[PDB]
Amino acid sequence: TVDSRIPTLIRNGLQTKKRSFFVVVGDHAKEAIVHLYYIMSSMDVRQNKSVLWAYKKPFELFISLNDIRYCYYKETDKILGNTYGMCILQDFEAITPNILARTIETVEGGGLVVLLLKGMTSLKQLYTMTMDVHARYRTEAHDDVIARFNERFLLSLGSCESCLVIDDELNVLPISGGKGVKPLPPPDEDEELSPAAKELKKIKDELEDTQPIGSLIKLARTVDQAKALLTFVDAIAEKTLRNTVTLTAARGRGKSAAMGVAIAAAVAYGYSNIFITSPSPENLKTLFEFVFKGFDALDYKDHADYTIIQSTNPEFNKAIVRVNIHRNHRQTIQYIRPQDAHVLGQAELVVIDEAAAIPLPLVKKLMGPYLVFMASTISGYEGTGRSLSLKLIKQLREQSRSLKEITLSEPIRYAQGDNVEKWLNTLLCLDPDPSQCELLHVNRDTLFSFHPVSEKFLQQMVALYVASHYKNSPNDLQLMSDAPAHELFVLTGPIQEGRLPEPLCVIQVSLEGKISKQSILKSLSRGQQPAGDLIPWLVSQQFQDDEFASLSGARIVRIATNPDYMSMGYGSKALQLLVDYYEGKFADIKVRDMHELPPLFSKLSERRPEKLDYVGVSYGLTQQLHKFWKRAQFVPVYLRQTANDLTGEHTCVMIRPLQDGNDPSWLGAFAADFHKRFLSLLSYKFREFPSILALTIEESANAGAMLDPSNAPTELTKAELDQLFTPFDHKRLESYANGLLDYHVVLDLMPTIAQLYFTGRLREAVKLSGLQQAILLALGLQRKDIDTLATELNLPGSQVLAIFMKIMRKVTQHFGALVSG
Amino acid sequence: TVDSRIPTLIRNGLQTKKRSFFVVVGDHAKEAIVHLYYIMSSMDVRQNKSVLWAYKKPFELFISLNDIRYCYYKETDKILGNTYGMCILQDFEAITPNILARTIETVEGGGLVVLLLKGMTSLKQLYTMTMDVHARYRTEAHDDVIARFNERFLLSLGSCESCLVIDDELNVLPISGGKGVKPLPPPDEDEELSPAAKELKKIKDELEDTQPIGSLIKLARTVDQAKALLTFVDAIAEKTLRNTVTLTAARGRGKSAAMGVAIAAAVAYGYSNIFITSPSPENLKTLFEFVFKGFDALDYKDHADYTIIQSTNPEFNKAIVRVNIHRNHRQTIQYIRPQDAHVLGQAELVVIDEAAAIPLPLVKKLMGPYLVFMASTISGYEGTGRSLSLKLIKQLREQSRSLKEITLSEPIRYAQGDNVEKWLNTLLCLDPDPSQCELLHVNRDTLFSFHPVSEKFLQQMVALYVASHYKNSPNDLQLMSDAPAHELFVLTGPIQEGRLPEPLCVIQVSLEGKISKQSILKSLSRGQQPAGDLIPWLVSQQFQDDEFASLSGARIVRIATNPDYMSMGYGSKALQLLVDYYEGKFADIKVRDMHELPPLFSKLSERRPEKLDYVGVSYGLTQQLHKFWKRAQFVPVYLRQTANDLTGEHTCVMIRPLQDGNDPSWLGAFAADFHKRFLSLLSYKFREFPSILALTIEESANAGAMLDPSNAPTELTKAELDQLFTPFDHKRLESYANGLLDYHVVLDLMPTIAQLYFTGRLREAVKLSGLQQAILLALGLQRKDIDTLATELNLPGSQVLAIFMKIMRKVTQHFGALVSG
Ligand SMILES: CC(C)(COP(=O)(O)OP(=O)(O)OC[C@H]1O[C@@H](n2cnc3c(N)ncnc32)[C@@H](O)[C@@H]1OP(=O)(O)O)[C@@H](O)C(=O)NCCC(=O)NCCSCC(=O)Nc1ccn([C@@H]2O[C@H](CO)[C@H](O)[C@@H]2O)c(=O)n1
Ligand SMILES: CC(C)(COP(=O)(O)OP(=O)(O)OC[C@H]1O[C@@H](n2cnc3c(N)ncnc32)[C@@H](O)[C@@H]1OP(=O)(O)O)[C@@H](O)C(=O)NCCC(=O)NCCSCC(=O)Nc1ccn([C@@H]2O[C@H](CO)[C@H](O)[C@@H]2O)c(=O)n1
Ligand SMILES: Nc1ncnc2c1ncn2[C@@H]1O[C@H](COP(=O)(O)OP(=O)(O)O)[C@@H](O)[C@H]1O
Ligand SMILES: Nc1ncnc2c1ncn2[C@@H]1O[C@H](COP(=O)(O)OP(=O)(O)O)[C@@H](O)[C@H]1O
């Protein structure tokens, strides 16, 4: 006698085409799943689909009757863009937030989601379970890890109306939030149909006569997708290259699939040069899948009218790089990286999938005097921050000849308003004068306790620091929840009682350091790296130092303010409060844990700070971001040569010696060493730096070198000048300074003069303005051509020569005076 | 009573459609020309065309009745691709060989060519005329200039059968070679027509039905041009991109015009991406002229089916850069420079006009997996050497899927076998064991005396040294003929009597130097440059030296061997003979000058050489050419940073101190100064040099610095090493040498280590192989990326790191031993 709730929930999910959720507890879950599949199959025959099964590393007879796909947790990326009738998760030890999102969105509506839990006497042991991720965050300085994600995961099962926590012998648990589910009325679909379906049938048959719309539009499944297809084709049909269509929606809405049909329409419309740009070739798996689907709807013949060129040479062997069409005249569909903007000088259509993830300058150069298609993801898994989307939307409007924007709401695989989708979005959190503001430390125990007040703030703070991420990674939530030493700080204004304060800025601080001299020397003699810390474990390796790792410090993992209050002062003010705080300036029912709840908003005054020596931040170098860090008295110590592939910017590490009463000389050695490294390294992979940006780093690094008085530079004597330049070199300089010689001859002297000036030897003798320093820096250490410098400075080439010659007569006169005197 | 020869010659030229030549002598030539035009017009009405007139800086009534175009001698390039019924040259002072060719080829068949000569008592004063060109060759060391081109010009008038040296009062001179011209038989063209015309009419009407050939083929004027059109279109019609058509002919044959119709055919055939590459946009004036002519034959409508985009922004405002076609789908015709090979990744047709003038590597990268059209000029004005054409033809055959070659012979504007064309080609000369060979000095007085034996050798030697010129410049003949100090040397084998020796190698040596210390200081204090000499006038300016210009030397203006005997030894052997020779090791009838003729083949033994200090050569740097010069014991002194636009290579100057018994130390200072300049300048515009090529220059320059013993480098002491690297830098080096650190960290030390090695400080301490030196040179002084180095060396990137790490453990151990010891 099976319980009647399981058949009731299964029928409810199938009738409305919304996913159902189940969790099995026990060591004999094989009996449960086969009974679950029996109920699902005995009530409907349209669900005999693939049963996705994921593990890290009778039932025997039944597994040989239905299609089962076994996919590894690390290999779950291969099932992207697919559809399965049931998702199964077996090993709890490896279901990260990223994996949970990936294996859930690939389930069709009306299916089942079943999660396998190992044999348990009671469910109270799940909150303290070990994982495969706390093993990452273990450090010798901070080892103990408190598991909080499992606490939130088990408490959130009650907030899902389609979740049934089933048992080994088919029994329901009180923690399940769907125990009170009532059966739906019997379906009546013989004549009555959903209004969206009637609207979808209306638009399909209305344009059936017209071609190529009549054949392509049958591929659409939603009204929102269909309206995008007409919007795309309408731009194509005008045969005018002054259009631009921007599409934004969530993940799983069909923007990429609708993008492919738009491209297939353009091919049939007589378009020769078609280009696709995307952050990764992986994102084009579905886009190129529906181009062929659209081609099949157009009755194109394989190996006769089109060919598929697969770029199997690189690691992404499955990626499609080019498709050639030779029906009447040779038409082509080429996939290029966003950086390759030179090929687009002859194009007619550019499709930019996931344009939000592309850096804004790349999109700016990608768009030209042709037709551009754009798609973006604003919510859901792998979403984008609201700030970058706003920047992209505003930028396109400035360029506007015609721009049209559309949106998609209804999903494809599951009905809108899905219960499991809402539960997962909530679980992963996918979607005043500064002087009066005060910083508050957020207690992580109450924050992730799934309390209604706690949950509301968690959504606000999560959306605060993911508002600028190029891609939304849910694994960061696992990081904050289960970190051993990460502390969360929020800056709020003066807020009255009864109203939760609005987070104006969120700072995540990780405690780093306390490295024993044995541990550093053990691994500095090898190539292995625990990578528990970043700032102490990099400066020690980069500088081959032994004392810095022994210090104790903090790493600013993430700092973000509200996008509405940007450039107002709520970020710098939070940093100063955080800096002063570390300076010691402030002296089987499983209900939510109502007890053991400390004040969520524990003020900094009532908590004693730790004794810290420095604060460090590792961040992607940008001119605006660097200016903010330098304002907070940070000095660079490191700057990675290999620019990040996704963003195109170099990682920069800054360290501030916040502790007062301590020697500011251990950092003076680090800043000086980097400063002398930067000058010589300005020609290796730093040649692409703008002159102004590279100058600012040099000034900041030089300022940091002044923390140590022993690093003060000495003047240049006459004896040193003679050792550096032969009399032939001097006579060349005098003639050029008089305007009697071309500048090309005196060009080998750039490294000598520029190094002398920027190392401080010539800095006090001759004073140069901001513009002259930038030209000398580029010509001397970046080895930039004059024409390249003229373009970058937005100045004529002759004017650059005039400024450069001004630099010489200042240097030439001092050199002559030094030798003569 | 006018003489009957002028009407007879005019009728002869008109009937056969060959140009006629006249020369007028006197101060009242206006009476002669108007009588000449009267005879021309009174006998035919199809000659009332434009009368081109060129000057540097009644008749009044008659000039207002006919079209006259006045063009400046320097501005004669604007009449390129035009057609005129009569060419007039007035000022003898500026009719250079280049100008003479330019103003002659633009005359239609049957027209007149009249050259105006100022009033003369006798013609004997023409041989000694000053010009506007000898003013260039005047030098303070060598001032007197003997005019020989005018001597050859006046003697060659007798070798032209259509040249009548007319007088002021219509009288003929004995020097004229057409005084015995007999009248042609009366024409019979009512029914009888030339066989070429019948063949031309046959091919036009045969393909009249077929389109787009039927309309385009009417543009052809010769059978050879027509056969090219069918050859071009046949490649287009196959719709297969595995074809390549190479066209070679003389200048004025119609290769460019036939190229345009081929492009217009491709547009009508459904070709979207069409690209044109040429050395200069000027060469495309006629090609783009006939594309529109072909478009008009296709009845394309301006501003409705095609648009003309003119690149007026640069200096070549008349150049057409792009043409867009939007009849059915957007088709385009884009003009790109040969260097821009990245855009061709999507193309369907590439037209390479004047492919011979393009460097071979550029053509190699221009051709890809598409259809390529090629045209070249092999003879006539602005021709190309036989060596480069052979290199291009062979290279294409190696790449062969299908290749077809065609040729054109019959001209367009004038009938084949034109008398004036043959006279001009002759006038401008447009078209054994080495141990047994001996060098011979060619006497310039007899060489340019127009003697039948002398003329035959002149054609062989001219074709010898223009066999490698990218473009054929006839002004060089004016240089050799009227130079004040240039001496011509030819190397011949042992040849029996009665047979003129075959020139195996020709060397043109210009005597340079003897600059007073006042003259150098006068202009070294200013920016003006007489530019009479090159090697003494550049080393003095580049090095700010005062003694080198006072020396006496020789410049090897041009050295070329027979293309059949290349890489055999006839060039190096001639150089050694020339070097030893300067070392003093060898103790109104105007007939051709039969008297005053020295031995044309005066041996070096019977002529006393001049006391010389050095021999210098200015040449375009190539790896093969540099190896030959270094073998002859030459050392570089200069290397221009700005690569030549046409060829893409940098000018290099080498100097050899051939004089024995003299101090080889004045050059040791020059070579050492360049060697220290090259190391620092390897990052400014020399970054494009291959590692092997840049290494060879460094070795050669370093070897030259050894001529001065005082320039020998000293060893590196322990004190110097500590001054260069801080203990942090040393500890970084030890860790990397052990394989305990990434190579990116130890990268700022490249300029320090590479400079130390290549300056000689570390050269004797540590020995590096040829491959290791090249990697260290590029990574240290060229700042090349590893991936760039891996591609250039045709080696995997990991292997480059392995070799680079080998370089360190040699340097690291010496540094440790130096400090420890
Ligand atoms: C706005 C803000 C800076 C200050 O906020 P404020 O508004 O409060 O500025 P304030 O008024 O105080 O001073 C005024 C002065 O600030 C300046 N300023 C004004 N506006 C801007 C501006 N828009 N940008 C910059 N500077 C600005 C200046 O212009 C002005 O000078 P001015 O005064 O006269 O005008 C800060 O709060 C904020 O939200 N930044 C956005 C989030 C962020 O990135 N924070 C830094 C994180 S570091 C550790 C870290 O994790 N790094 C990473 C990052 C990514 N990745 C990977 O890449 C992927 C995603 O990228 C992937 O996810 C992965 O993660 C990674 O691996 N590691
Ligand atoms: C062939 C030749 C070198 C030796 O002749 P050989 O056959 O005899 O060589 P040999 O047997 O003695 O030694 C064997 C060794 O020679 C080597 N070697 C073997 N074959 C080659 C090879 N094909 N090329 C190179 N090196 C080779 C080596 O590979 C082998 O080593 P290996 O041994 O084991 O194998 C010489 O004779 C010759 O024709 N060179 C062609 C004409 C030329 O350019 N001469 C130099 C002129 S400099 C002053 C000057 O005016 N410069 C310019 C030039 C242009 N421009 C502007 O650019 C426009 C036009 O460009 C425009 O017109 C304007 O003018 C300008 O402004 N200024
Ligand atoms: N018109 C359609 N017809 C059928 N399936 C579709 C359609 N549109 C989307 N899908 C489903 O959605 C998946 C594609 O993901 P999609 O939502 O297009 O990515 P994105 O979120 O980038 O738009 C495919 O696996 C497919 O099953
Ligand atoms: N098919 C043609 N019809 C008329 N004129 C032509 C034709 N072909 C060549 N010409 C004449 O030749 C000139 C073009 O020079 P051309 O010989 O094509 O240059 P290239 O020597 O590079 O082929 C034009 O001025 C034109 O008058």
* Cis peptide leading into residue A212 (ω within 30°): yes
- Taking the CA of residue B569 as reference, the ligand 2 atom at the shortest distance is 11
φ, ψ (nearest 5 deg) of residue A370: -150, -165
The residue whose CA is least distant from atom 42 of ligand 1 is A560
A285 lines ligand 3 (CB under 6 A): no
CB contact residues (below 8 A), chain B span 671-700, against chain A: 673, 676-677, 679-681, 683-685, 687
Topology adopted by domain A195-407: Rossmann fold (3.40.50)
- Sign of the alpha-carbon dihedral angle for A790, A794, A800, A804: negative
**Angle, CA A660 vertex, CA A654 and CA A661 arms, to 5°:** 130
Interface size between A and B, measured as CB pairs under 8 A = 113
* Whether B770 contacts chain A with CB within 8 A: no
- Sorted by sequence, the CB contacts under 8 Å of residue A89 that are 6+ apart come out as A54, A95, A100, A103, A114, A115, A116
Q: Which residue has the tokens 């100045």?
A: A795
Instruction: State the sign of the Cα–Cα–Cα–Cα dihedral A772, A776, A779, A784.
Output: negative
CA dihedral (A249, A251, A252, A257) in degrees, to 10, reads: 70
Please name the amino acid found at residue B593.
D
How many Cβ atoms sit within 10 Å of the Cβ of residue B790?
A: 17
Binding residues of A: 81, 219, 225, 252-261, 286, 353-354, 413, 559-561, 566-572, 631
Centre of ligand 1 to C-alpha A625, Å, is 5
DSSP E strand stretches across B548-630: 552-561, 614-620
Nearest partner of B626 among B613, B638, B635, judged by Cα: B635
Q: In this structure, what are the phi and psi dihedrals at residue B80, rounded to the nearest 5 degrees?
A: -65, 135
Question: Within an 8 Å CB–CB cutoff, is residue A710 touching chain B?
Answer: no
Instruction: Give the helix ranges, DSSP H, for B105-252.
Output: 134-137, 149-155, 195-206, 213-216, 223-237
Query: Helix, strand, or coil here: B504?
Result: coil
Which atom from ligand 2 is nearest to the alpha carbon of B573? 12
User: Which among A558, A581, A424 is positioned nearest to A503, based on CA atoms?
Assistant: A558
Cα separation, A240 vs A401, whole angstroms: 10
Please provide the distance, in angstroms rounded to a whole number, between the alpha carbons at the two ends of chain A: 108
Query: What is the C-alpha to C-alpha distance for residues A248 and B693, in angstroms, rounded to an integer?
Result: 54
Determine what percent of chain A falls in helix, strand and coil, rounding each to the nearest 5: 40, 15, 40
CA–CA separation, B346 vs A344, rounded Å?
A: 10
CB-based contact, A727 to chain B, within 8 Å:
no
**Spatial CA neighbour of A254 closest among A49, A356, A77, A406:** A406
Residue with tokens 């899902």: A160
Q: Which helix (H) or strand (E) holds A730?
A: helix A727-737
Supply the DSSP symbol for B779.
I
Closest CA to B255 of B383, B75, B364: B383
Q: Per the CB < 8 Å rule, is A681 touching B642?
A: no
H or E stretch covering A513: strand A505-513
Q: Identify each DSSP E strand in A327-437 by its residue range.
A: 331-336, 349-352, 371-379, 404-407
Q: Reduced to 3 states, what is the DSSP secondary structure of residue A261? A: helix
Beta bridge partners of B656: B615
* Interchain contact, B783 vs A683, CB within 8 Å: yes
Q: Where are the domains of chain A?
A: 5-167, 195-407, 432-510+555-612, 713-820
- How far is residue A804's CA from residue A816's CA, in Å, rounded to a whole number? 18
In SS3 terms, B418-439 reads as CHHHHHHHHHHCCCCCHHHCEE
Given CB atoms, is B797 within the 8 Å cutoff of chain A?
Answer: no
Which residues form ligand 1's pocket by a CB distance below 6 Å?
Answer: A 468-470, 556-561, 566-572, 617, 619-620, 622, 624-625, 627-628, 647
Q: Which residue has the tokens 């690569």?
A: B643
Q: Which residue of B has its CA nearest to A782?
A: B683
To one decimal, the resolution in angstroms is: 3.2
Q: Which residues of B touch A732 (CB under 8 A)?
A: 543-544
**CB of B758 closer than 8 Å to CB of B779:** no
Residue A412, amino acid: I
Rounded CA-CA distance A15/A9 in Å is 10
Cβ neighbors of A130 (< 8 A, separation 6 or more) are A93, A147
The interface residues of chain B toward chain A in range 233-252, judged by CB-CB distance below 8 A, are none
Put simply, the chain B residues between 629 and 648 with a CB less than 8 A from any chain A CB are: 641-642
Which of the residues A523, A748, A761, A786 would you substitute to probe the B interface, choosing the one with the greatest number of B C-beta atoms within 10 Å?
Answer: A748
Q: What is the DSSP letter of A72?
A: E
**What DSSP string runs through A199-249?**
HHHHHHHHTSSSTTHHHHGGG--SHHHHHHHHHHHHHHHT--S--EEEEEE
Closest-CA residue to B250 (of B19, B418, B20, B77) = B418
Q: Does A5-167 match A432-510+555-612 in CATH topology?
A: no
CA distance B428 to B462: 9
Between vectors from CA A449 to CA A443 and to CA A454, what angle results, nearest 5°?
70
Instruction: Indicate the residue of A328, A525, A751 with minimum beta-carbon distance to B740.
Output: A525
Strand bridging mode A320-325 / A331-336: antiparallel
E strands in A390-464: 404-407, 438-442
Longest Cα–Cα distance of chain B, Å, equals 109
CB-CB: which of A272, A329, A543 is closest to B728? A543
The CA dihedral of B379, B383, B388, B392, to the nearest 10 degrees, is: -80
Under an 8 A CB cutoff, do B750 and A684 touch? yes
Burial letters B775-788, b for 16+ CB under 10 A, else e: bbbbbbbbbbebeb
Three-state DSSP at A729 gives helix
- Determine the distance separating the centroid of ligand 4 and the alpha carbon of B324, expressed in angstroms: 24
DSSP letter, residue A58? -
Pairing of strands B273-277, B438-442: unpaired
Peptide bond into B501 cis (omega under 30): no
Nearest CA to ligand 2 atom 21: B624
CA-based nearest distance A619→chain B, Å: 19
Q: After which residues is chain B broken (C to N over 2.5 A)?
A: 57, 400, 431, 587
- Domain spanning B433-508+559-608: which CATH class is it, in words? alpha beta
CB-count exposure of residue A176 (10 Å: 0-12, 13-18, 19+) = buried
Tell me which residue of B280, B259, B262 sits closest to B271, measured CA to CA.
B262
Helix (H) or strand (E) holding A51: strand A51-55
Q: What is the distance of C-alpha B293 from the center of its chain?
A: 31
Q: In whole angstroms, what is the distance from residue B597 CA to residue B605 CA? A: 19
Q: How far apart are CA B793 and CA B787, in angstroms?
A: 10
Distances in whole angstroms, Cα of residue B233 to Cα of each of A744, B24, B332, B412, B504: 50, 48, 18, 21, 43
Return the closest-CA partner of residue B637 out of B589, B676, B682: B676
Nearest Cα to Cα of residue A682 among A768, A779, A756, A599: A779
**What's the burial of A296, exposed, middle or buried (CB within 10 Å: 0-12/13-18/19+)?**
middle
| Contact (CB, 8 A) for A458 and A377 | no
The encoded tokens of residue B501 equal: 């020796």
Report the DSSP pairing between strands A84-89 and A614-620.
unpaired
Backbone dihedral angles phi then psi of residue A636, each to the nearest 5 degrees: -70, 150
Q: How many angstroms from the chain centroid is the CA of residue B233?
A: 32
- B530: tokens are 């007489």
Q: In CATH, which of 3.40.1130, 3.50.50, 3.40.630, 2.40.50 is domain A432-510+555-612?
A: 3.40.630
Give the best residue of A331, A343, A642, A683 to mutate against chain B (max B CB count within 10 A).
A683
Q: Which DSSP helix (H) or strand (E) runs through B506?
A: strand B505-513
Return the CATH class of domain B5-167.
Answer: alpha beta
Rounded to the nearest angstrom, the minimum Cα separation between B748 and chain A is: 5
- Ligand 1 atom 18 nearest Cα: A624
Within an 8 Å CB–CB cutoff, is residue B546 touching chain A? no
- Least distant ligand from the CA of A284: 3
Which tokens is B516 given?
């007073």
Place of tokens 């730093």: A686
> Atom 38 of ligand 1 has which residue's CA nearest to it?
A560
Q: Which atom of ligand 3 lies closest to the CA of A411?
A: 17
Sign of the torsion angle spanned by Cα atoms A102, A104, A109, A115: positive
- Which strands sit side by side in the sheet containing B306-310, from one edge to the other? B306-310, B320-325, B331-336, B273-277, B349-352, B371-379, B244-250, B404-407
